[PDB]
Design a protein around this ligand. Structure first.
Ligand SMILES: [Ca+2]
Ligand SMILES: [Ca+2]
Ligand SMILES: [Ca+2]
Length: 137
């Protein structure tokens, strides 16, 4: 909800597993010639040097206010204490590289001391890997 729009999420750590719900997003930035985008969300635990934690929602065509309503589960291990949940919205493009739309992240430990829930401001790509900005109201 500021330049790159906002996203509604839920994420809690229930003994063993991290549960994430990606509800919807609003006011996303136009990344297509038609003035829209084809948004999908990529969920990842970072760092992910082996590149194995990737999960993704379906792609919704031609919209800036997608409603995915999809949930995901990551098995956690003691090694994940220092990892973060990365949430990135991307714009599916058929004839070129997919465009970045907005992102954010949560510390696994952070989520364990308080599950995330509600609206969050979409951040730039690099910075999105470092923090999140909740939007109460
Ligand atoms: Ca595009
Ligand atoms: Ca597109
Ligand atoms: Ca592109």
């Amino acid at each position: 909800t500021e330049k790159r729009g906002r996203i509604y999420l839920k994420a809690e750590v229930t003994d063993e597993k991290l549960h994430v719900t990606v509800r919807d997003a609003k006011n996303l930035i136009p990344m297509d010639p038609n003035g829209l985008s084809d948004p999908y969300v990529k969920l990842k635990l970072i760092p992910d040097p082996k590149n194995e934690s990737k999960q993704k929602t379906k792609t919704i065509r031609s919209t800036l206010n997608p409603q995915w309503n999809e949930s995901f589960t990551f098995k956690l291990k003691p090694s994940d204490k220092d990892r973060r949940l990365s949430v990135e919205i991307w714009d599916w493009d058929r004839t070129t590289r997919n465009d970045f739309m907005g992102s954010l992240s949560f510390g696994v430990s952070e989520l364990m001391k308080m599950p995330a829930s509600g609206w969050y401001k979409l951040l730039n790509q690099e910075e999105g890997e470092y923090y999140n900005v909740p939007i109460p109201e």
